[PDB]
Amino acid sequence: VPRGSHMSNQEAIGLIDSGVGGLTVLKEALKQLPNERLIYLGDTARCPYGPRPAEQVVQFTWEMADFLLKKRIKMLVIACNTATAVALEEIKAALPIPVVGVILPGARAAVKVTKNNKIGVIGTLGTIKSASYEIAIKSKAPAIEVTSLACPKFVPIVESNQYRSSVAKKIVAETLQALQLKGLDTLILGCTHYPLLRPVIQNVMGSHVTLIDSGAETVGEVSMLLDYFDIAHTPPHEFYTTGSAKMFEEIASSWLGIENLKAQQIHLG
């Protein structure tokens, strides 16, 4: 632009995720931060990250972060709970721009909303094995009881378009019975895909349990940071994928309500 580069605050916020699931976080940014320009990258060619070794996830997440940094983003959001669980500390420490992940904001919202100090979190194998949630919660409130439960079947339920089905209900109930002795009043949906399962999880957990949406809370934290440092955009979005642009578009355009949404396939390896 004639100015040279864009004004710092006019640059995009970047979001990285293992695929299309992270569009639950992006959709929250469209809602809560409509003035911001967004650049999204999903590593669909290597999804899922859930079951992968931490070292692989850190590598792949760095490749995504490096790609978006070159696009002059003013802030990076690691939209993926699995990537946040193992990669956030290192990436945050290494970059000069704000870096936020999706675990801490959910943890803090859970501490805020709990009344009985019994909190659960569900997520991928990798997320839960990292113990990141237990650490994020107990760093601030060490006496809270935290129960962490991997739900590996949940991502595939959403991917197969069965997230409203009888099968979904049976699988969720079968898995979540592992929580039932813990007296929880709060459950963190610690995975990008779980908002699509929210009504099923709520039915299983009942009316006394408050569910926490990772993207919703993380986007609220982004909003806070933008305002605090006066770097909000003054009153198109870009989509990148390592898989098929068309297959990305079919999920995204409708999910997000952007009719002429075009995605671009890129290579990271």
Place this chain on the structure above:
Amino acid sequence: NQEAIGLIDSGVGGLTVLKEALKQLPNERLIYLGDTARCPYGPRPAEQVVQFTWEMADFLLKKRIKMLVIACNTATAVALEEIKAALPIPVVGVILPGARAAVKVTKNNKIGVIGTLGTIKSASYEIAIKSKAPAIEVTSLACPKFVPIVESNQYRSSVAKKIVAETLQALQLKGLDTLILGCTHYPLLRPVIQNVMGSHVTLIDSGAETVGEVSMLLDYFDIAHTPEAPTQPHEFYTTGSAKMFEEIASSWLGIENLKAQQIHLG
């Protein structure tokens, strides 16, 4: 950073915010100042509230606090920007976190806020919300009788319930799905307000949201207390009667034998 978080308010009402900090931030040491001798701020001119708020901030600054929370919505409405710009420590108020929470929770894009005359006159809520998410319709309503109801201690009475119903009658009609409790005192009225608005209106507690934000900021600025109990007690200061402050605070916070000191400002 082992130094205290400071909280300032026009009186004892801001202990609704402090109570949230005890719950969400139990590792942190707190210093609270309430300007009881000049409470209420609600009906005062902006300029006067700014001066008083500066006096409070300056008093806690001398106590080596690492962060300042303006717990009072009325004070936040007029004084936050200038105090934040001037001080060498982070400063947070109670308005923006409520505004952000309301943007997050609304589904129908119809949000209300209630507060003192001062808070509502400032238009801080409307400005904050419209600068972030301008699709939202914001209804702002001053509720001048509410602080007196809570100050009277008779905030669960038939008289109180009638006044809340009368005051919010027009607001009930707006089809809101979210209502910000934009005043330190209003958590005390929350069940009555929820009964009047209906179970489908999500109420936003300023203090609860603000402390959640403080928690995130302590980690972001890398100034959180170590994960253990502090070694020095919380401290409580008032420009009114310490005896009265103690009686209210010990009961409300569940800290028996809490002690406060009376200080002078201005």
